[PDB]
Design a protein around this ligand. Structure first.
Ligand SMILES: [Ca+2]
Ligand SMILES: [Zn+2]
Lengths: 237, 165
Protein backbone atom coordinates (compact mmCIF):
# COMPACT_ATOMS: atom_id res chain seq x y z
CA UNK A 1 0.00 0.00 0.00
CA UNK A 2 2.11 2.91 1.29
CA UNK A 3 5.52 1.71 0.01
CA UNK A 4 3.91 0.22 -3.11
CA UNK A 5 2.23 3.53 -4.00
CA UNK A 6 5.48 5.49 -3.59
CA UNK A 7 8.44 3.55 -5.00
CA UNK A 8 9.58 3.74 -8.61
CA UNK A 9 11.72 0.87 -9.89
CA UNK A 10 14.62 3.27 -10.56
CA UNK A 11 15.05 3.38 -6.74
CA UNK A 12 14.97 -0.40 -6.08
CA UNK A 13 18.35 -1.21 -7.71
CA UNK A 14 20.71 -0.18 -4.91
CA UNK A 15 18.31 -2.11 -2.70
CA UNK A 16 18.35 -5.30 -4.84
CA UNK A 17 22.19 -5.32 -4.60
CA UNK A 18 21.90 -5.96 -0.85
CA UNK A 19 19.06 -8.46 -1.47
CA UNK A 20 19.58 -10.22 -4.85
CA UNK A 21 17.56 -13.17 -3.49
CA UNK A 22 14.35 -11.10 -3.65
CA UNK A 23 14.83 -9.83 -7.24
CA UNK A 24 13.41 -12.94 -8.90
CA UNK A 25 10.62 -12.93 -6.30
CA UNK A 26 9.81 -9.32 -7.30
CA UNK A 27 9.97 -10.08 -11.03
CA UNK A 28 7.68 -13.14 -10.99
CA UNK A 29 5.12 -11.34 -8.80
CA UNK A 30 4.11 -8.84 -11.52
CA UNK A 31 1.70 -11.07 -13.44
CA UNK A 32 -1.66 -9.23 -13.16
CA UNK A 33 -2.06 -7.59 -16.58
CA UNK A 34 -3.47 -4.06 -16.93
CA UNK A 35 -2.87 -3.46 -20.68
CA UNK A 36 -3.44 -5.47 -23.88
CA UNK A 37 -6.99 -4.33 -24.72
CA UNK A 38 -8.19 -2.21 -27.65
CA UNK A 39 -11.52 -1.35 -29.28
CA UNK A 40 -12.70 -3.00 -32.51
CA UNK A 41 -14.74 -1.22 -35.20
CA UNK A 42 -17.61 -3.15 -36.78
CA UNK A 43 -18.01 -4.88 -39.13
CA UNK A 44 -14.77 -6.52 -37.95
CA UNK A 45 -13.20 -8.51 -40.79
CA UNK A 46 -10.88 -11.27 -39.61
CA UNK A 47 -7.99 -10.22 -41.87
CA UNK A 48 -7.86 -7.21 -39.50
CA UNK A 49 -7.57 -9.67 -36.58
CA UNK A 50 -4.35 -9.18 -34.65
CA UNK A 51 -2.37 -12.40 -34.14
CA UNK A 52 -2.72 -14.14 -30.73
CA UNK A 53 -5.65 -12.01 -29.57
CA UNK A 54 -9.04 -13.15 -28.21
CA UNK A 55 -12.19 -11.14 -28.90
CA UNK A 56 -14.53 -10.00 -26.12
CA UNK A 57 -18.01 -8.79 -27.01
CA UNK A 58 -20.00 -7.47 -24.05
CA UNK A 59 -22.02 -4.46 -22.81
CA UNK A 60 -18.72 -3.22 -21.31
CA UNK A 61 -17.20 -2.99 -24.78
CA UNK A 62 -16.50 -4.80 -28.02
CA UNK A 63 -12.75 -5.22 -27.58
CA UNK A 64 -9.80 -7.39 -28.66
CA UNK A 65 -7.64 -8.72 -25.82
CA UNK A 66 -4.14 -10.22 -25.77
CA UNK A 67 -3.86 -13.90 -24.78
CA UNK A 68 -1.55 -13.32 -21.77
CA UNK A 69 -3.90 -10.59 -20.51
CA UNK A 70 -7.03 -12.73 -21.12
CA UNK A 71 -8.58 -13.99 -17.85
CA UNK A 72 -11.86 -15.36 -19.28
CA UNK A 73 -9.85 -18.14 -20.96
CA UNK A 74 -8.83 -21.37 -19.20
CA UNK A 75 -5.11 -22.31 -19.34
CA UNK A 76 -5.70 -26.05 -18.74
CA UNK A 77 -8.27 -26.55 -21.53
CA UNK A 78 -7.33 -27.78 -25.01
CA UNK A 79 -9.37 -26.60 -28.00
CA UNK A 80 -9.38 -28.62 -31.26
CA UNK A 81 -7.52 -27.75 -34.45
CA UNK A 82 -8.65 -27.18 -38.03
CA UNK A 83 -7.23 -30.67 -38.61
CA UNK A 84 -9.43 -32.12 -35.86
CA UNK A 85 -12.27 -30.19 -37.50
CA UNK A 86 -11.46 -31.85 -40.84
CA UNK A 87 -11.43 -35.29 -39.21
CA UNK A 88 -14.85 -34.38 -37.74
CA UNK A 89 -16.06 -33.34 -41.22
CA UNK A 90 -14.86 -36.71 -42.50
CA UNK A 91 -16.75 -38.53 -39.69
CA UNK A 92 -20.00 -36.43 -39.88
CA UNK A 93 -22.28 -39.42 -40.38
CA UNK A 94 -21.05 -40.89 -37.09
CA UNK A 95 -21.94 -37.71 -35.14
CA UNK A 96 -25.25 -36.52 -36.59
CA UNK A 97 -26.95 -35.91 -33.22
CA UNK A 98 -23.85 -34.22 -31.74
CA UNK A 99 -23.92 -31.84 -34.72
CA UNK A 100 -27.77 -31.66 -34.92
CA UNK A 101 -27.48 -27.90 -34.50
CA UNK A 102 -25.35 -27.55 -37.66
CA UNK A 103 -27.80 -29.51 -39.80
CA UNK A 104 -30.84 -27.44 -38.66
CA UNK A 105 -29.13 -24.47 -40.36
CA UNK A 106 -29.82 -26.01 -43.77
CA UNK A 107 -33.60 -25.81 -43.08
CA UNK A 108 -34.23 -29.28 -44.58
CA UNK A 109 -32.69 -28.27 -47.94
CA UNK A 110 -30.72 -31.09 -49.58
CA UNK A 111 -29.11 -28.76 -52.14
CA UNK A 112 -27.46 -26.60 -49.47
CA UNK A 113 -26.44 -29.88 -47.85
CA UNK A 114 -24.86 -31.29 -51.03
CA UNK A 115 -22.85 -28.05 -51.28
CA UNK A 116 -21.56 -28.57 -47.74
CA UNK A 117 -20.11 -31.99 -48.68
CA UNK A 118 -18.04 -30.22 -51.38
CA UNK A 119 -16.96 -27.39 -48.96
CA UNK A 120 -15.36 -28.69 -45.74
CA UNK A 121 -14.44 -25.28 -44.21
CA UNK A 122 -18.14 -24.65 -43.58
CA UNK A 123 -18.47 -27.63 -41.25
CA UNK A 124 -14.92 -26.95 -39.92
CA UNK A 125 -15.66 -23.37 -38.93
CA UNK A 126 -18.92 -24.36 -37.26
CA UNK A 127 -17.22 -27.24 -35.46
CA UNK A 128 -14.45 -24.88 -34.29
CA UNK A 129 -16.79 -22.15 -33.07
CA UNK A 130 -19.11 -24.66 -31.37
CA UNK A 131 -16.26 -26.15 -29.34
CA UNK A 132 -15.51 -22.65 -28.03
CA UNK A 133 -19.18 -21.63 -27.59
CA UNK A 134 -21.91 -24.28 -27.64
CA UNK A 135 -24.73 -21.67 -27.64
CA UNK A 136 -24.56 -20.75 -31.34
CA UNK A 137 -26.97 -21.09 -34.25
CA UNK A 138 -25.80 -21.44 -37.84
CA UNK A 139 -27.77 -20.43 -40.92
CA UNK A 140 -26.72 -21.64 -44.37
CA UNK A 141 -27.42 -19.91 -47.70
CA UNK A 142 -26.05 -20.34 -51.23
CA UNK A 143 -25.11 -17.93 -54.03
CA UNK A 144 -23.77 -18.97 -57.47
CA UNK A 145 -23.42 -22.56 -56.24
CA UNK A 146 -21.30 -21.48 -53.25
CA UNK A 147 -22.31 -22.13 -49.63
CA UNK A 148 -22.04 -19.25 -47.13
CA UNK A 149 -22.81 -19.30 -43.40
CA UNK A 150 -23.94 -16.96 -40.64
CA UNK A 151 -23.35 -18.03 -37.03
CA UNK A 152 -25.52 -16.30 -34.42
CA UNK A 153 -24.44 -16.29 -30.79
CA UNK A 154 -27.46 -16.83 -28.51
CA UNK A 155 -25.98 -14.86 -25.59
CA UNK A 156 -25.16 -11.12 -25.64
CA UNK A 157 -21.83 -11.54 -23.82
CA UNK A 158 -19.56 -13.49 -26.18
CA UNK A 159 -15.90 -14.39 -25.76
CA UNK A 160 -14.16 -15.78 -28.85
CA UNK A 161 -10.91 -17.41 -27.68
CA UNK A 162 -7.64 -16.70 -29.48
CA UNK A 163 -6.80 -20.24 -30.63
CA UNK A 164 -10.41 -20.75 -31.83
CA UNK A 165 -9.80 -17.87 -34.26
CA UNK A 166 -6.33 -18.96 -35.36
CA UNK A 167 -7.86 -22.31 -36.37
CA UNK A 168 -10.84 -20.61 -38.04
CA UNK A 169 -8.58 -18.61 -40.31
CA UNK A 170 -6.69 -21.81 -41.18
CA UNK A 171 -9.91 -23.52 -42.33
CA UNK A 172 -11.01 -20.26 -44.02
CA UNK A 173 -7.74 -19.19 -45.72
CA UNK A 174 -7.70 -17.63 -49.23
CA UNK A 175 -11.16 -18.87 -50.30
CA UNK A 176 -13.21 -17.39 -47.42
CA UNK A 177 -13.72 -14.08 -45.66
CA UNK A 178 -14.97 -13.93 -42.09
CA UNK A 179 -16.50 -10.85 -40.47
CA UNK A 180 -17.75 -10.37 -36.92
CA UNK A 181 -20.72 -8.07 -36.45
CA UNK A 182 -23.47 -7.19 -33.95
CA UNK A 183 -27.10 -6.93 -35.07
CA UNK A 184 -30.09 -6.27 -32.79
CA UNK A 185 -27.73 -6.80 -29.79
CA UNK A 186 -26.65 -10.30 -31.00
CA UNK A 187 -23.20 -11.34 -32.28
CA UNK A 188 -23.06 -12.74 -35.82
CA UNK A 189 -20.02 -14.26 -37.51
CA UNK A 190 -20.39 -14.17 -41.30
CA UNK A 191 -18.42 -16.60 -43.44
CA UNK A 192 -18.36 -15.77 -47.16
CA UNK A 193 -17.09 -18.24 -49.77
CA UNK A 194 -15.39 -16.51 -52.71
CA UNK A 195 -14.42 -19.68 -54.60
CA UNK A 196 -15.07 -23.42 -54.25
CA UNK A 197 -11.70 -25.13 -54.59
CA UNK A 198 -11.38 -28.88 -55.17
CA UNK A 199 -11.96 -31.12 -52.16
CA UNK A 200 -9.71 -34.18 -52.09
CA UNK A 201 -12.19 -36.16 -49.94
CA UNK A 202 -15.69 -37.45 -50.74
CA UNK A 203 -18.36 -37.60 -48.04
CA UNK A 204 -21.15 -40.13 -48.54
CA UNK A 205 -23.88 -37.67 -49.51
CA UNK A 206 -26.69 -40.24 -49.51
CA UNK A 207 -26.27 -41.70 -45.99
CA UNK A 208 -25.83 -38.11 -44.74
CA UNK A 209 -28.82 -36.60 -46.60
CA UNK A 210 -31.09 -39.54 -45.81
CA UNK A 211 -30.02 -39.68 -42.12
CA UNK A 212 -30.59 -35.91 -41.81
CA UNK A 213 -34.15 -36.16 -43.23
CA UNK A 214 -34.96 -38.78 -40.57
CA UNK A 215 -34.18 -36.50 -37.60
CA UNK A 216 -37.02 -34.62 -35.88
CA UNK A 217 -36.61 -30.89 -35.27
CA UNK A 218 -37.59 -30.20 -31.64
CA UNK A 219 -40.04 -27.33 -30.94
CA UNK A 220 -37.57 -25.57 -28.61
CA UNK A 221 -35.09 -25.65 -31.50
CA UNK A 222 -37.76 -24.78 -34.07
CA UNK A 223 -39.10 -21.74 -32.17
CA UNK A 224 -35.63 -20.49 -31.15
CA UNK A 225 -34.30 -20.92 -34.72
CA UNK A 226 -37.45 -19.23 -36.05
CA UNK A 227 -36.58 -16.12 -34.02
CA UNK A 228 -32.96 -16.03 -35.21
CA UNK A 229 -33.47 -16.58 -38.97
CA UNK A 230 -35.06 -13.10 -39.11
CA UNK A 231 -32.09 -11.44 -37.40
CA UNK A 232 -29.67 -12.52 -40.17
CA UNK A 233 -32.03 -11.53 -42.97
CA UNK A 234 -32.07 -8.03 -41.43
CA UNK A 235 -28.23 -7.86 -41.35
CA UNK A 236 -27.93 -9.09 -44.94
CA UNK A 237 -30.47 -6.48 -46.05
CA UNK B 1 35.35 -0.88 -17.17
CA UNK B 2 35.88 -4.60 -17.83
CA UNK B 3 34.11 -5.20 -14.49
CA UNK B 4 31.28 -2.90 -15.61
CA UNK B 5 31.10 -4.62 -19.00
CA UNK B 6 30.88 -8.00 -17.25
CA UNK B 7 28.31 -6.70 -14.73
CA UNK B 8 25.94 -5.74 -17.59
CA UNK B 9 26.38 -9.08 -19.38
CA UNK B 10 25.86 -11.10 -16.19
CA UNK B 11 22.69 -9.11 -15.42
CA UNK B 12 21.29 -9.58 -18.93
CA UNK B 13 21.69 -13.36 -18.56
CA UNK B 14 19.94 -13.30 -15.19
CA UNK B 15 16.97 -11.01 -15.99
CA UNK B 16 16.27 -12.65 -19.37
CA UNK B 17 17.21 -16.06 -17.94
CA UNK B 18 19.46 -16.95 -20.83
CA UNK B 19 21.77 -19.93 -21.01
CA UNK B 20 25.42 -19.47 -21.99
CA UNK B 21 24.80 -20.25 -25.68
CA UNK B 22 21.86 -17.81 -25.84
CA UNK B 23 23.80 -14.57 -25.27
CA UNK B 24 26.29 -13.13 -27.73
CA UNK B 25 28.98 -10.90 -26.21
CA UNK B 26 31.23 -8.57 -28.19
CA UNK B 27 34.49 -7.70 -26.41
CA UNK B 28 34.88 -4.33 -24.63
CA UNK B 29 38.11 -3.46 -26.45
CA UNK B 30 36.36 -3.76 -29.83
CA UNK B 31 33.29 -1.92 -28.40
CA UNK B 32 35.42 0.89 -26.91
CA UNK B 33 36.77 1.77 -30.37
CA UNK B 34 33.36 2.19 -32.05
CA UNK B 35 30.30 3.77 -30.36
CA UNK B 36 27.79 2.05 -32.72
CA UNK B 37 28.45 -1.57 -31.57
CA UNK B 38 26.13 -3.54 -29.27
CA UNK B 39 27.58 -4.85 -26.00
CA UNK B 40 25.45 -8.02 -26.07
CA UNK B 41 22.77 -9.65 -28.26
CA UNK B 42 20.21 -11.84 -26.53
CA UNK B 43 18.51 -14.77 -28.31
CA UNK B 44 14.81 -14.63 -27.37
CA UNK B 45 12.39 -17.57 -27.31
CA UNK B 46 8.83 -17.18 -28.56
CA UNK B 47 5.89 -17.31 -26.13
CA UNK B 48 8.31 -16.44 -23.34
CA UNK B 49 7.73 -13.43 -21.10
CA UNK B 50 10.80 -11.17 -20.71
CA UNK B 51 11.43 -8.43 -18.16
CA UNK B 52 12.65 -5.76 -20.60
CA UNK B 53 11.90 -2.74 -18.38
CA UNK B 54 13.77 -4.07 -15.35
CA UNK B 55 16.73 -4.86 -17.63
CA UNK B 56 16.71 -1.35 -19.12
CA UNK B 57 16.38 0.13 -15.64
CA UNK B 58 19.26 -2.00 -14.28
CA UNK B 59 21.34 -0.67 -17.18
CA UNK B 60 20.33 2.93 -16.37
CA UNK B 61 21.26 2.09 -12.75
CA UNK B 62 24.83 0.97 -13.52
CA UNK B 63 25.47 3.41 -16.37
CA UNK B 64 25.30 7.19 -16.53
CA UNK B 65 23.65 6.70 -19.94
CA UNK B 66 20.10 6.25 -21.18
CA UNK B 67 20.19 2.64 -22.40
CA UNK B 68 18.99 1.61 -25.84
CA UNK B 69 17.92 -1.91 -26.82
CA UNK B 70 16.73 -3.03 -30.24
CA UNK B 71 14.68 -6.06 -31.35
CA UNK B 72 16.08 -7.58 -34.55
CA UNK B 73 14.29 -10.22 -36.61
CA UNK B 74 16.94 -12.63 -37.93
CA UNK B 75 14.32 -14.44 -40.04
CA UNK B 76 13.71 -17.52 -37.90
CA UNK B 77 14.01 -15.78 -34.51
CA UNK B 78 14.17 -12.41 -32.76
CA UNK B 79 17.18 -11.16 -30.84
CA UNK B 80 17.42 -8.20 -28.45
CA UNK B 81 20.60 -6.22 -29.13
CA UNK B 82 21.71 -4.15 -26.15
CA UNK B 83 23.51 -0.78 -26.31
CA UNK B 84 24.67 1.38 -23.37
CA UNK B 85 24.13 4.62 -25.32
CA UNK B 86 21.92 4.95 -28.41
CA UNK B 87 23.89 4.36 -31.64
CA UNK B 88 24.55 7.30 -33.99
CA UNK B 89 23.11 5.45 -37.01
CA UNK B 90 20.92 2.33 -37.13
CA UNK B 91 19.33 -0.05 -39.65
CA UNK B 92 17.09 2.24 -41.70
CA UNK B 93 13.58 1.01 -40.94
CA UNK B 94 13.94 1.69 -37.22
CA UNK B 95 11.06 2.84 -35.04
CA UNK B 96 10.07 2.87 -31.37
CA UNK B 97 8.07 0.20 -29.58
CA UNK B 98 4.35 0.37 -28.68
CA UNK B 99 1.99 -2.19 -27.10
CA UNK B 100 1.98 -4.27 -30.30
CA UNK B 101 4.54 -4.35 -33.09
CA UNK B 102 4.90 -6.19 -36.39
CA UNK B 103 8.62 -6.82 -36.93
CA UNK B 104 9.91 -7.63 -40.44
CA UNK B 105 13.47 -8.86 -41.23
CA UNK B 106 14.14 -5.50 -42.88
CA UNK B 107 12.89 -3.53 -39.87
CA UNK B 108 14.25 -3.04 -36.34
CA UNK B 109 12.44 -1.93 -33.15
CA UNK B 110 13.99 0.37 -30.56
CA UNK B 111 13.10 0.05 -26.88
CA UNK B 112 14.03 2.68 -24.30
CA UNK B 113 12.67 3.49 -20.83
CA UNK B 114 10.73 6.48 -22.21
CA UNK B 115 8.67 4.28 -24.58
CA UNK B 116 7.74 2.11 -21.60
CA UNK B 117 6.58 5.07 -19.47
CA UNK B 118 4.13 5.91 -22.27
CA UNK B 119 2.71 2.37 -22.24
CA UNK B 120 2.43 1.83 -18.48
CA UNK B 121 -0.58 3.57 -16.80
CA UNK B 122 1.00 4.26 -13.38
CA UNK B 123 4.66 4.20 -12.33
CA UNK B 124 4.49 2.77 -8.80
CA UNK B 125 3.26 -0.85 -8.91
CA UNK B 126 3.58 -1.54 -12.62
CA UNK B 127 6.28 -3.50 -14.44
CA UNK B 128 6.13 -3.98 -18.20
CA UNK B 129 7.31 -7.13 -19.91
CA UNK B 130 7.65 -8.17 -23.55
CA UNK B 131 6.69 -11.31 -25.50
CA UNK B 132 7.67 -12.41 -29.01
CA UNK B 133 5.21 -14.38 -31.17
CA UNK B 134 5.53 -16.17 -34.49
CA UNK B 135 3.34 -14.37 -37.05
CA UNK B 136 0.65 -15.69 -39.36
CA UNK B 137 3.35 -15.34 -42.03
CA UNK B 138 6.62 -17.31 -42.04
CA UNK B 139 9.22 -14.49 -41.90
CA UNK B 140 7.37 -12.08 -39.59
CA UNK B 141 7.29 -11.82 -35.78
CA UNK B 142 5.17 -9.88 -33.30
CA UNK B 143 6.59 -8.04 -30.30
CA UNK B 144 4.05 -7.46 -27.54
CA UNK B 145 4.71 -5.03 -24.68
CA UNK B 146 2.23 -5.45 -21.81
CA UNK B 147 2.14 -3.79 -18.37
CA UNK B 148 1.63 -5.84 -15.18
CA UNK B 149 0.72 -5.27 -11.53
CA UNK B 150 1.34 -7.74 -8.65
CA UNK B 151 -0.66 -10.88 -7.77
CA UNK B 152 -1.12 -9.69 -4.18
CA UNK B 153 -0.43 -6.14 -2.98
CA UNK B 154 0.08 -7.43 0.56
CA UNK B 155 2.83 -9.80 -0.61
CA UNK B 156 4.34 -6.99 -2.69
CA UNK B 157 4.36 -4.55 0.22
CA UNK B 158 5.76 -7.30 2.48
CA UNK B 159 8.51 -7.75 -0.10
CA UNK B 160 9.17 -4.01 -0.20
CA UNK B 161 9.36 -3.99 3.62
CA UNK B 162 11.73 -6.99 3.66
CA UNK B 163 13.91 -5.07 1.18
CA UNK B 164 14.47 -2.33 3.81
CA UNK B 165 15.58 -4.08 7.03
CA1 LIG C 1 9.36 7.66 -4.90
ZN1 LIG D 1 -9.47 -15.41 -24.25
Amino acid sequence: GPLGSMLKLSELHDVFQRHPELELKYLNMMKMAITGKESICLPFNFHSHRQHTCLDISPYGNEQVSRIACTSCEDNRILPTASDAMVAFINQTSNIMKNRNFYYGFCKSSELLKLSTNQPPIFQIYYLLHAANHDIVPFMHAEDGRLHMHVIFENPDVHIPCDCITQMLTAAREDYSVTLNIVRDHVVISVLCHAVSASSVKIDVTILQRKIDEMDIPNDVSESFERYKELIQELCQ
Amino acid sequence: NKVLHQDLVQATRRILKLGPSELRVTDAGLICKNPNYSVCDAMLKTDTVYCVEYLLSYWESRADHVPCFIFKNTGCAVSLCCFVRAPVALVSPARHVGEFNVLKVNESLIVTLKDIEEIKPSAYGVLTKCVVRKSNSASVFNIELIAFGPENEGEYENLLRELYA
